[PDB]
């Protein structure tokens, strides 16, 4: 499950299945993997009401930072995002 | 055409061609299959103004149901949406 | 870099690596080529604050128009939008 949510805004799915929200009023992105029931919060940091989320091919994570008007990313198992 | 719109927020686009759109005013999501002059209203049942939408390989579609703080999806074909 | 974003809402990402924002709050959408430095505007017209925005494998760009209530839609290379 999801949970814990604040009027989430964006979604994403990626070839594995696992869904990656933006839990906009919670200022992160959460994540399911599928066949999981425990979500993960992604290490972004400094979001402001980020508002969409996008999954590329190599499963980098693409956030529209809506409050700080910038676009930042995450690669896959990488804790560092980079603003764009 | 998309008709009655209300707002829209969210947008996804299948392998197909068959466009989703998260028709936020009106409490629903809508699509429009490639090639098709109508657009269907998706089984959703109590969305409070939805605003983000996905469509996996599957054909399965997610959405944030954002004023119930909660993500829901439907299988192709299926009228039962699951909240995850 | 994205730069004079306004409140970005949404945001996608194609198989080449090009990432599309709606830049909301500039009545516009944008995008980043993979390895640029440089983003363009895409050519739409006369948007009202876009919300999402998704893009196919054919590199046509789908954005919801969210203040005129419609979704609208290029192909790529083409200079003139499609209302759907
Ligand atoms: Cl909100
Ligand atoms: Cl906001
Ligand atoms: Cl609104
Ligand atoms: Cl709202
Ligand atoms: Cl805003
Ligand atoms: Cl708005």
């Given at each position: 499950?999801?949970?814990?949510?604040?009027?989430?805004?964006?979604?994403?799915?990626?070839?594995?299945?696992?869904?990656?929200?933006?839990?906009?009023?919670?200022?992160?992105?959460?994540?399911?993997?599928?066949?999981?029931?425990?979500?993960?919060?992604l290490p972004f940091?400094?979001?402001?009401?980020?508002?969409?989320?996008?999954?590329?091919?190599?499963?980098?994570?693409?956030?529209?930072?809506?409050?700080?008007?910038?676009?930042?990313?995450?690669?896959?198992?990488?804790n560092?995002?980079?603003?764009?």
């Amino acid at each position: 499950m999801f949970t814990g949510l604040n009027t989430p805004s964006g979604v994403a799915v990626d070839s594995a299945g696992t869904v990656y929200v933006t839990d906009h009023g919670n200022n992160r992105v959460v994540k399911l993997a599928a066949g999981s029931n425990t979500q993960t919060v992604l290490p972004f940091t400094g979001l402001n009401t980020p508002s969409g989320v996008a999954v590329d091919s190599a499963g980098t994570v693409y956030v529209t930072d809506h409050g700080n008007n910038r676009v930042v990313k995450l690669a896959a198992g990488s804790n560092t995002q980079t603003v764009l």
